[PDB]
Amino acid sequence: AETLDPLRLPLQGERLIEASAGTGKTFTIAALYLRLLLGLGGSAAFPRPLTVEELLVVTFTEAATAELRGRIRSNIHELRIACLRETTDNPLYERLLEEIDDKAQAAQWLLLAERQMDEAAVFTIHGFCQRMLNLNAFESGML
Amino acid sequence: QWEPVLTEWITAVLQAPLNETGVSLSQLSARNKQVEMEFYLPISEPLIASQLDTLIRQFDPLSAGCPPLEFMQVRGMLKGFIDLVFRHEGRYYLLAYKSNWLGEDSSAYTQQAMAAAMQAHRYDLQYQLYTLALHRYLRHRIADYDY
């Protein structure tokens, strides 16, 4: 087992992150989400930047989906604000901004994401399969 | 049960001559037809019954029948559908179909009883109102219009 840096994690193939309670497991999901939106981490980064509607997050409770949806909304907002101010008072955003190359284009993608946040993909499983079937029906052999 | 019963009757309708001009419904070209006109007639200051039905009764023989019509003060728009409007001899007309009458078949429709039912269902005020509408619409459309 290796210790984790949110910004060092390669996002390729399957990856398991394990840690005890209160360790900020939920808290990290935000950071990886942003990272995914911007395509950051370099070597550890995903091949190409992704669109809010292409990111799947699956959580345990309907309430948790609401909360996490909100937190991701806020964090995208704040990070955008920072990208326009080029400085920030929070350490994680500060490291992200050190990694980011062009801050302007970054702010543009962020804005677009922020708009897309309505249809942003967050579900539970029982809320996921629900959608997915009704999405692609033939394959699934559904009405 | 109807089709052979209807197709005869309709012909009797379309073939009936009308008014004094003796017009047959059959004679009307689609150029002179206007079917089912919807109109909106604005009424500006509140329209009070008694301030009207006196004007009605005064010039109207038909409004002698039954009490003065009673409706609460109203200000607003008025709606209606002309069944049919057509012009013959350069002269317009206003046509409205009515059906009803559960009880009867024969002469229970006469010059008298028609005028009776008109006064019973208050089609009086109705036709007067349309005539107002058609009037304003012609005054609008026809250059140099005269009632």
């Binding site: 210790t3 390729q12 992150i17 394990e18 992704l50 799947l56 699956v58 948790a64 699934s140 | -």
Partner: protein, 246 residues
């Protein structure tokens, strides 16, 4: 026949759909739709669930997958979740990653728990579930709770008196005592003596910040009846009872 559907039936039908020969087309669409997936609270996982996520993302390039879970926390077995399938996934994943520090609670609470689970070896009695000590953060270092002046230790175990105890006696007494302790914190909370303090900052203890965790319903009612007897208004958040029964 009715063309209806249900919760278990949803998951089941997606699993079956993938399972079928045609389903491989299906999977291809999803790998297009979501070329990443981050599953949270994965320590609770079903055989079906893992069969799905694997069959979709276990292979092909350019798709990621992120499983997030603490196997210590999987309590939902009754609902059909299974730890063993989690341990299976843990087996078939080459990479592991660990987060070091607890950010949630006081520096006292960390050391308390660590002490309590270090008492034996292999506390969780699954060789595959080792306990490890965790370290509090620096943001929390100043956290303290004060009740009538001097700080109250982070954890207080209330030991019953007497020799043999049946479940009923225990449920009466302990609920009652909990209530008595709760109203004391409150009365000291309205006078501003007892405080939740991060460093110099504080706030009195409102009946909001207290939570009482119980295993089952009857238990919870047992708590409330005594706790409202002391004129403390209380809610039960898991209550599934319907209005019409009142």
């Amino acid at each position: 026949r009715r063309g209806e559907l249900g919760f278990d039936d949803m998951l089941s039908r997606l699993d079956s759909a993938l399972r079928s020969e045609s389903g491989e087309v299906l999977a291809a669409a999803i790998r297009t739709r979501f070329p990443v997936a981050m599953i949270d609270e994965f320590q609770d996982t079903d055989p079906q669930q893992y069969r799905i996520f694997r069959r979709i993302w276990h292979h092909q390039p350019e798709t990621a997958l992120l499983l997030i879970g603490d196997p210590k926390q999987a309590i939902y077995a009754f609902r059909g979740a299974d730890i063993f399938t989690y341990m299976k996934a843990r087996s078939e994943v080459h990479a592991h990653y660990t987060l070091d520090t607890n950010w949630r609670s006081a520096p006292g609470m960390v050391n308390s728990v660590n002490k309590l689970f270090s008492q034996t070896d292999d506390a969780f009695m699954f060789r595959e579930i080792p306990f490890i000590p965790v370290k509090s953060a620096g943001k929390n270092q100043a956290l303290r709770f004060v009740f009538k002046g001097e700080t109250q230790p982070a954890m207080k175990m209330w030991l019953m008196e007497g020799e043999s105890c049946g479940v009923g006696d225990y449920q009466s007494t302990m609920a009652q005592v909990c209530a008595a302790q709760i109203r004391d914190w409150l009365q000291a909370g309205q006078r501003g003596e007892a405080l939740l303090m991060n460093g110099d900052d504080a706030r009195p203890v409102r009946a909001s910040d207290i939570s009482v965790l119980v295993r089952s319903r009857q238990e919870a009612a047992q708590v409330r009846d005594a706790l409202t007897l002391l004129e403390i208004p209380s809610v039960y958040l898991s209550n599934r009872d319907s209005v019409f029964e009142t």
